[PDB]
Design a protein around this ligand. Structure first.
Ligand SMILES: OC[C@H]1O[C@H](OC[C@H]2O[C@H](O)[C@@H](O)[C@@H](O[C@H]3O[C@H](CO)[C@@H](O)[C@H](O)[C@@H]3O)[C@@H]2O)[C@@H](O)[C@@H](O)[C@@H]1O
Ligand SMILES: OC[C@H]1O[C@H](OC[C@H]2O[C@H](O)[C@@H](O)[C@@H](O[C@H]3O[C@H](CO)[C@@H](O)[C@H](O)[C@@H]3O)[C@@H]2O)[C@@H](O)[C@@H](O)[C@@H]1O
Lengths: 109, 109
């Protein structure tokens, strides 16, 4: 996982961080997704155990407990594709998508 | 202006004079010789624009198009990935791909 972004299909596991300078996003053990120094939280403390942050192919951020039950969702959705949730240096977590261009250094093209 | 993050380039931000994005061993450099070069992956990548202009710069606009302009605003290279109006981000990912995502569909604030 990248240090400051999350891609669709990826998981920010329990006690995992996304960090950009002083802004520290934590998917906590108590199920609360907290953006430290960013005055933002999902407000889902004690709503489950072994909670994980995912990003759907429609650009929706989802918090699921250990059994895979949805605890919280960002609600905003767009077209099927590849999205990226980025911790902006000004202290906002932003979902961007879908992908419109890619540089591929793994294939000569 | 927006503060810089080593692996990110947001809409409006500019790279030039060997300014670059880095992630692990990967580097995406807007070189002084007007060539945009990705050093990394297996084969790397280049815009193949060495000497096509002077004092060139890279800029991601608010439609998701990534462009190399010279000192006189002559187009040197373009991603030709123009999409919906909004905020975009170019990410030099940990896996070597440099991907443009947008528009922004959700934010914490
Ligand atoms: O300063 C930002 C914000 O702080 C407070 O919200 C974040 C806290 O929300 C809950 O209280 C918890 O999720 C807490 O998490 C800590 O305590 C847990 C219980 O001990 C623990 O399991 C977690 O690992 C973590 O240590 C969050 O820290 C609140 O005061 C907001 O008003 C304020 O904006
Ligand atoms: O692995 C990335 C890429 O490398 C090769 O293309 C990039 C080179 O293209 C031109 O030769 C130059 O832009 C060169 O830049 C270096 O040399 C310049 C002078 O010749 C100098 O001004 C620059 O600062 C830099 O030192 C690039 O390195 C090629 O193998 C690609 O296939 C490959 O993908």
């Amino acid at each position: 996982l990248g240090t400051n972004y999350l891609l669709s299909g990826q998981t920010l596991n329990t006690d995992g961080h996304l960090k950009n300078g002083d802004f520290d996003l934590v998917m906590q053990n108590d199920c609360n997704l907290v953006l430290y120094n960013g005055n933002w939280q999902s407000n889902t403390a004690n709503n489950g155990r072994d909670c994980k942050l995912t990003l759907t192919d429609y650009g929706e951020l989802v918090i699921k407990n250990g059994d895979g039950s949805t605890v919280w969702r960002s609600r905003a959705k767009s077209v099927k594709g590849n999205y990226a949730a980025v911790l902006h240096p000004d202290g906002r977590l932003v979902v961007f998508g879908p992908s419109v261009f890619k540089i591929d250094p793994w294939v000569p093209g | 202006n927006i503060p810089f993050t080593d692996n990110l380039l947001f809409s409006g931000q500019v790279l030039y004079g060997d300014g670059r994005l880095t992630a692990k061993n990967h580097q995406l450099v807007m070189q002084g010789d007007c060539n945009l070069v990705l050093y990394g992956g297996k084969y790397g990548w280049q815009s193949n624009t060495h000497g096509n202009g002077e004092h060139c710069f890279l800029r991601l606009n608010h439609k998701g198009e990534l462009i190399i302009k010279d000192d006189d605003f002559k187009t040197i290279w373009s991603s030709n990935s123009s999409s919906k109006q909004g905020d975009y981000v170019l990410i030099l990912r940990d896996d070597g791909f440099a991907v443009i995502y947008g528009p922004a569909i959700w934010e914490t604030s």
